[PDB]
Structure 1
């Protein structure tokens, strides 16, 4: 009552700028949900509105959709899908299983996106030619993130790096960073033929390139969204589809509690502590 007639002040915490539900309609950035659906922007458009708070151009939305689709799943042997399958096979709920698989997405699994983008951006912004960037990684005893495939090397491409790369070529206006990454790929493939761009590296470089190459970003917003972790977000959102698919699969196949074989353990306990 005292605030309705406004004789009192209370400081409000939780500043928010990605949604407003108080009012006639849902508003994502400044855009009502009816306008969101009327202009026919897809899931990529609502990532633009919610994550970056901008009405991205059509090719950016379609590229975000594309990189979500390529990230969706990569089999069950992977560490995160392993955790999701283990927890789904222990009778837990969808949220717990997806959560237990998502908690693995970090630096070693799922971290190639953001690390590859950070590394390539730092190399490109400091004016190092690819031939010197490769040697400077070598001297530091560090591998280049986003470069290196186990099997598919040459006249045997990743076949989904190709799709993403074609989309970037035909639709993005300028790719200063993808071209740099491809020169580094040429050098490292001269070294060993299976050191091609990953999907994990091409998505990173193409997303940085989309952020700082399309409109609406000022190269201080584009360089901030990379640091905050928008690429970790893309990997997590894309791989949530695969993890929930694995949950539904293991729960539909009606499989019971997993118990790791003792022969695949090796107990190295101390003698007597």
Structure 2
């Protein structure tokens, strides 16, 4: 009996196969990166609007500057003279909880609230009573009538092309309530990608509800952020090498030493 099982790619034949589709057919059908992701991650031939949406998610998450945890760690690692893979990985390892984990957390929280049948106002008043933050809501500067253009771009695409967007509709009702009190409590990019990704899996027609719930549960949205942000982290590595930036050492004046 075989010790390994695999479902995504077969390289043994005359031609490379991605989830049952020969590579020449992947190109003939113009599936793109989005469609290759649909085959390798989900073993589905996704509709073209789903492929393009996935590509849009990767584009909007590609980078968010050098100050965030992962980009900062990659930069330090490049400045210490390390190779591309080590530097990228040093940054990627910061991802999953407080940094880059909100896509997954927003998808789960909004799905749970929606599936439980609680209306948006009561979801908001419950989270306010329990003292818990709504994942995927809030921005430091952007506000209801000063939108995050990444959210706008995704939202226009999703609402036009998806057969339905019930979770996004629910999240937007939450946003109307939260922004009535504090204008900066908008549906942020992590919240938008999270809910729209659930809407894609649940309504594109390629998944049963059980499969959609499983892919969220095992971390498909963490995968999206990781693959997307890897573009920016490789870019930071290349940039630090070209800028001939030397070894970094954090300044002592920014560290409080509280030893016994």
* Same fold flag (TM > 0.5): yes
Q: RMSD of aligned C-alpha atoms?
A: 0.6
Q: What are the ranges of 5 or more consecutive residues in structure 2 without an aligned counterpart? A: none
Aligned partners of 1:155, 1:186: CA distance in 2, in Å?
11
Aligned partners of 2:222, 2:97: CA distance in 1, in Å?
10
**Per the alignment, in what secondary structure is the counterpart of residue 217 of structure 2?**
helix
Looking at secondary structure, tell me which structure has more strand per residue: 2
Q: What stretches of structure 1 move > 2 A for 4+ residues in a row?
A: none
| Residue number in structure 2 paired with 1:6 | none
After TM superposition, the structure 1 = structure 2 runs for residues 1-12 of structure 1, keeping only pairs within 5 Å, are 11-12=1-2
Looking at secondary structure, tell me which structure has more helix per residue: 2
Aligned partners of 1:52, 1:132: CA distance in 2, in Å?
35
Rg larger in 1 or in 2?
1
C-alpha deviations, 1:183-240, integer Å up to 9, x for none?
Answer: 0000000110000011011000000000001111000000000000000000000000
**Per the alignment, in what secondary structure is the counterpart of residue 266 of structure 1?**
strand
* 1:155 positional shift: 2.1
| Residue number in structure 2 paired with 1:164 | 154
**Per the alignment, in what secondary structure is the counterpart of residue 104 of structure 1?**
coil
C-alpha deviations, 1:4-34, integer Å up to 9, x for none?
Answer: xxxxxxx101110000000111111000000
TM-score (norm 1): 0.94
Q: What are the ranges of 5 or more consecutive residues in structure 1 without an aligned counterpart? A: 1-10
Aligned partners of 2:149, 2:206: CA distance in 1, in Å?
31
* 1:90 positional shift: 0.3
* 1:164 positional shift: 0.4
Aligned partners of 1:204, 1:110: CA distance in 2, in Å?
12
Aligned partners of 1:135, 1:12: CA distance in 2, in Å?
53
**Per the alignment, in what secondary structure is the counterpart of residue 15 of structure 1?**
strand
* 1:110 positional shift: 0.3
* 1:166 positional shift: 0.3
* 1:154 positional shift: 2.8
* 1:269 positional shift: 0.7
TM-score (norm 2): 0.99
* 1:169 positional shift: 1.2
Q: 1:64 aligns with which of 54, 62, 68?
A: 54
* 1:141 positional shift: 1.6
Aligned partners of 1:14, 1:268: CA distance in 2, in Å?
50
